[PDB]
Amino acid sequence: AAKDVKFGNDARVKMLRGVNVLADAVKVTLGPKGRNVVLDKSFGAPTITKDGVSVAREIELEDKFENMGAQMVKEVASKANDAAGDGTTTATVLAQAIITEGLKAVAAGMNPMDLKRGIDKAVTAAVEELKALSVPCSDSKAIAQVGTISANSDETVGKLIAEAMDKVGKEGVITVEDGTGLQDELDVVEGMQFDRGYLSPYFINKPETGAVELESPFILLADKKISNIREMLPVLEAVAKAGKPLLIIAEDVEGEALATLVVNTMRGIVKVAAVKAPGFGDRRKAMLQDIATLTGGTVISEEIGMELEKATLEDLGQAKRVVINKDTTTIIDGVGEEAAIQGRVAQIRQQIEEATSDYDREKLQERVAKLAGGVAVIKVGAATEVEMKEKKARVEDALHATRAAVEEGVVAGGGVALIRVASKLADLRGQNEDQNVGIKVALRAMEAPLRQIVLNCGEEPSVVANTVKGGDGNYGYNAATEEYGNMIDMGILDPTKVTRSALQYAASVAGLMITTECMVTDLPK
C-alpha cells in the first residue's frame, strides 16, 4: 500500500500535535480537582472515568501522522498501568513535557541523540535520588492515607483497604467486585492465589487490563502434559456437554495447537482457559491436590489410575468465580469441602514441624499461608452502574497504590518528590553541551506534574511551583485546600514505586520520539 513520507520539522510538528491531543485528553484528570472524561463505549452506555490509562486507550486520531504520535505516547500510560496501576496520568504529563521541551531544543539545532542521552542520564540520577528519599511505609495509618489519595481523596476507600490488608496480612490477596448494593462491604472467604497464569493471550476477555475471568467455571486438575488435542478432547467434550466454563491446569501445553482448537470449537459455546501447573514435582502435585479439595475435585493422575479420557465432571473441580492474568491466578471462592479444607490446614501446619528442614518447612509454611489466609473481597457500593464502574476503578487504583507503598515506601505527594529530586540534580552535567541541555530538559519536565495539578485547580501554576521550590523537604502545596505545609503531616503520600515507574517510562518513550527525523505511513485513502 502506497506510503506517505514526511521529513524533519514537517514531521515533528505533526507528531507533537497528536501527542498534545492525547495529553490534553488525559491530563485534565490529574490531581484532586481533576475532572472526569466521558468515553463513548458505543456498544453501550458511555463510561465516566478518571483513570488516565482508560482515557489514553480510546484516543486515536484520523490524521495518520498525528495518530502515530498519539499511539507512541499511549505506551507510557499502558506501561505505567503495569507497575501497580496508579501513576498513568503523571506518566503521560511527564512524557508530554519532555517531548515539548526536547523538540524546542532540537529546533535550536542540538543533536537529538545527545538530548536523549542526557535525558536518560538525568532520569537515572533521579531514580537513585528518589530511592534514597523514599521512607518505608509500614504503619496502617500511612497505608490508609495512601489509599484515600489514590481513591481521589475518598476516606472510605482508604479505611476499607487498610482494614482488609491488616486483616488478611500484608501479603494476602485482595480483589474487587461490583456492588451488591448501595453500601460497600468487606468480607473474607477461603480462597488462594498461585503464581501461574493463562497460557495464551487469545483467552483474554472483557477487561482491557489483560485479564480473563470465569463464573462458575469447572476446574481441571491434570498431572499430564498436553502433547496434542488428543489428550484434551474427552475433557473438552465433558465440559462442553456440561455447558459451563473450564480452567485447564496442566503441566505443559503445545499452546499454538490449543489456540487453533479454541478458535474452531470455542467460537460461541463455552469459555475456557489454560494455565501452567503450579510448582514442580512434589510441589506441583501438592498444589494440585490442594486445589482439588478446595474445589471439590479429584487429582486426575495416572498414578491413581485416572486418565484424561476417564476424567469425569467431578474429577474436574469447580469454582464460583475465578480471575486470571498472564502470570497469576486467583480462586475468588471455591466450592470446596469446608471441613476437609480446615482439617488439611491443621495437617499441613503439623508437617511444618515434621519437615523441619529449612526449605521443606518453607514449602509447608507457604501452603498454610496460601490456604488459611483466604481472600478478602471488597464489594464496591454504588447506586448506579455508571457510579459502579467509576468507583470500582478508583478502588482498584487504591489497592495497587497500597501494594506499591508497602513494597517501596512513600514520598511526598502532590508532585513534590519530583521537584525535590530535580533541585538536588541541578549540579549534574553531561559529556557535552547537547547532553547538558538534555539534562536540563529532563529536570524542567519534572516540574510538570505539580504545575498541572494546580492548573486543574485553576490556581497560578508558576506562582505555586515557585513557592514549593523555595521550600525544603516535604514542604509542598495541598491542592485540595490551597494550604502549603508538610505533605506527610497532611498524609498526601505517593508510593515511591509509582513515581519511579512514571518517570522511567515517560523518559524512555519521550527520549526516543525526540530522535524522529522521518515518518512513513499509509496514504490517507
Which residues contact ligand ADP (rule: CB under 6 A)?
29-32, 34, 52-53, 86-90, 149-150, 153, 413-415, 449, 453, 478-480, 492, 494
Task: Answer yes or no: are the C-beta atoms of 141 and 155 closer than 8 Å.
Answer: no
C-alpha–C-alpha distance, residues 424 and 325, integer Å: 40
- What is the C-alpha to C-alpha distance for residues 430 and 356, in angstroms, rounded to an integer? 55
* Dihedral sign (CA 507, 508, 511, 514): negative
According to DSSP, the residues that pair with 410 across neighbouring strands are: 135, 495
Q: Is 290 within 8 Å of 367 (Cβ atoms)? A: yes
- The interface mask with ligand BEF, positions 51-70, x = CB under 6 A, is xx------------------
Does position 231 bind Mg ion by CB under 5 A? no
Sign, CA torsion 383/388/391/392? positive
| 494 annotated to a ligand binding site | yes
- Please answer whether residues 27 and 77 qualify as being in contact, where contact means their C-beta atoms are separated by less than 8 angstroms: no
Please say whether the beta carbons of 340 and 228 come within 8 A: no
Binding range to ligand BEF, per CB under 6 A, among 56-64, 80-88, 287-295, 451-459? 80-88
Q: How many CB atoms lie within 10 A of CB 482?
A: 11
| Residue 82 in marked binding region | no
126 marked ligand binding residue: no
Interface characters, 84-103, with Mg ion (x: CB under 5 A): --x-----------------
Give the span between the Cα atoms of 211 and 193, in whole angstroms. Answer: 15
Site string for a second copy, 456-475 (x = CB under 8 A): -xx-xxxx-xx---------
- Nearest-angstrom CA–CA distance, 447 and 463: 12
Using CB under 8 A as the binding rule, the residues of this chain from 179 to 208 that contact a second copy are 182
Establish if 130 lies at the interface with a second copy (CB under 8 A): no
Query: Which partner from the list K ion, ligand BEF, ligand ADP, none does 480 bind, CB cut-off 5 to 8 Å by kind?
Result: ligand ADP
Helices vs strands, H then E, count in the chain: 19, 18
User: Does 328 count as an annotated binding residue?
Assistant: no
Least separation in angstroms between residue 431's CB and ligand BEF is 23
Is 521 labeled as ligand-binding? Answer: no
Applying CB under 6 A, among 231, 397, 408, 494 the residue interacting with ligand BEF is: 397
Determine if 256 is a binding residue for a second copy (CB under 8 A): yes
How long a stretch of residues is the chain? 525
CB 248 within 8 A of CB 275: yes
What residues numbered 81-110 form the site for a second copy, per CB under 8 A?
Answer: 100, 103-105, 107-110
x/- track of binding to K ion for residues 46-85 (CB under 5 A): ----x-x---------------------------------
> Rounded to whole angstroms, what are the CA distances from 336 to 196, 272, 289, 371, 455?
20, 20, 12, 12, 54
**Cα–Cα nearest to 27, from 92, 100, 82:** 92
Is 472 assigned to a binding site?
Answer: no
Q: How far is the CB of 26 from Mg ion (least distance, A)?
A: 12
Check binding of 415 to K ion (CB under 5 A). Answer: no
Give me the torsion for CA of 38, 41, 44, 49, rounded to 10°: -40
Site residue total, a second copy (CB under 8 A) = 108
Q: Cα separations (Å) of 253 from 137, 250, 277? A: 42, 7, 10
Q: Which stretch binds ligand BEF (CB under 6 A): 83-91, 97-105, 227-235, 318-326?
A: 83-91
What minimum distance in Å lies between the beta carbon of 324 and a second copy?
18
Say if residue 89 carries a ligand binding annotation. Answer: yes
Residue 231 binds to ligand BEF (criterion: CB under 6 A): no
* Contact between 20 and 86 (Cβ < 8 Å): no
Where along the sequence are the contacts to K ion (CB under 5 A)? 29, 34, 50, 52, 89
Please report, in range form, the residues annotated as the binding site. Answer: 29-32, 50, 86-90, 414, 478-480, 494
- Binding residues (CB under 6 A) for ligand BEF: these are 51-52, 86-90, 397
Annotated binding site for ATP: 29-32, 50, 86-90, 414, 478-480, 494
